[PDB]
Amino acid sequence: SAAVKEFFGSSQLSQFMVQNNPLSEITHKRRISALGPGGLTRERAGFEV
DNA sequence: TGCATCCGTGAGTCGAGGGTAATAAAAAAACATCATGGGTTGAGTGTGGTTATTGGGGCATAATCGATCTGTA
């Protein structure tokens, strides 16, 4: 339960869901990110990615 | 001299939630320490008490009107 709770809420890929519009809802749930565990960082990422 | 190796660097205001957790032993004795409760100091705040009065009203001792029967050309 500790590990699953840390992933659900304390991880980078789980963040508060935007609720301004239904469009914001859809475009936040249909989102692809290249960060988080095993991914790049904004400082590290160059140009090709 | 060439080689790998290590060591700093790299923006700017801003917002919103904002904290989570793999584990573990009990006895005993011994001692320290605060917590409450009851009793002296002591420290007040509390309350009447005598004696300084200064305006006010008062009674004396004087005073300036108001009203009528006797003396002078």
From Swiss-Prot:
Superkingdom as given in the UniProt entry: Bacteria
Biotech use: Co-administration of salinamide and rifampicin or salinamide and myxopyronin suppresses the emergence of resistance to both antibiotics.
Record PTM text: Acetylated on several lysine residues in the presence of glucose.
Assembly, per entry: The RNAP catalytic core consists of 2 alpha, 1 beta, 1 beta' and 1 omega subunit. When a sigma factor is associated with the core the holoenzyme is formed, which can initiate transcription. The rRNA transcription and antitermination complex (rrnTAC) consists of RNAP, NusA, NusB, NusE (rpsJ), NusG, SubB, ribosomal protein S4, DNA and precursor rRNA; S4 is more flexible than other subunits. In pull-down experiments interacts with CedA.
Assigned protein family: Belongs to the RNA polymerase beta chain family.
Record function comment: DNA-dependent RNA polymerase (RNAP) catalyzes the transcription of DNA into RNA using the four ribonucleoside triphosphates as substrates.
Entry protein name: DNA-directed RNA polymerase subunit beta
Taxonomic path: Bacteria, Pseudomonadati, Pseudomonadota, Gammaproteobacteria, Enterobacterales
Gene designation per UniProt: rpoB
